[PDB]
Amino acid sequence: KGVVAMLPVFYRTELLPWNLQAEFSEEISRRLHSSDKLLLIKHHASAGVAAQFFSPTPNISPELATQLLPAEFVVAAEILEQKTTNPSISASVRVRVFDIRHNKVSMIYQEILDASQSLASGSNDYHRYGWRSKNFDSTPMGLMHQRLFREIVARVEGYVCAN
Ligand code: NA
């Protein structure tokens, strides 16, 4: 199994009763944990150590990655946007994976993944049916999120295991 560290999800910016970054961090973390392809470590990386992996052009010395050891790979997912507009709700995430083996830091995967769902597909009462509630996964946002989280982890698994 590839040994991975997940950074808190990055989101640069509210009518939602929960924090989108917190949902995305937990839901991706739960799926990397459940993956039998990936061993998800617990780390305590500082704000600045995590943040460097989200710089558009990263510059990360080996010294600046040691807080993520003993992971071999660092998963850095950024929410670029979640928006509405057959009006729909959509979200876009930039996924990066870095290889931090061998006292080096290299970005081995970068891709923008996205998902969209018709707002008519279910209820948009995100206070009655918000994240964690039973029926969130039946709302347009929850359906969209579920597919996106599944794709994010499938891609991470593929690129980690390829390497
Ligand atoms: Na796992």
**What experimental approach yielded this model?**
X-ray
Superfamily grouping for domain 2-162: ABC-type transport auxiliary lipoprotein component (3.40.50.10610)
Q: How many CB atoms lie within 10 A of CB 84?
A: 11
CA distances 102 to 66, 70, 120, Å, are 11, 11, 50
Contact partners, residue 162, CB within 8 Å, separation at least 6:
none
Resolution (A): 1.6
Pair type for strands 88-99 and 73-84: antiparallel
Write b or e for each residue in 119-139: b if 16 or more Cβ atoms lie within 10 A of its Cβ, otherwise e: bebbeeebeebbbebeebeeb
Distance 152 CA to ligand 1 centre (A): 14
DSSP notation for 86-129: --EEEEEEEEEEEE--TT--EEEEEEEEEEEEEGGGS---TTTS
Contact partners, residue 23, CB within 8 Å, separation at least 6:
131, 145
- In the numeric block, which tokens belong to residue 40? 């998800």
The owner of tokens 């707002």 is: 119
Pair type for strands 10-11 and 88-99: unpaired
Distance 57 CA to ligand 1 centre (A): 29
Distance 112 CA to ligand 1 centre (A): 23
Distance 29 CA to ligand 1 centre (A): 9
Helix axes 140-162, 20-34, angle to 10 degrees: 50
DSSP notation for 17-64: SS-HHHHHHHHHHHHHHH-SSEEEPP----HHHHHGGGSSS----GGG
The owner of tokens 């617990």 is: 42
What is the Cα 128 distance to its own chain's centre? Answer: 25
CB 83 within 8 A of CB 117: no
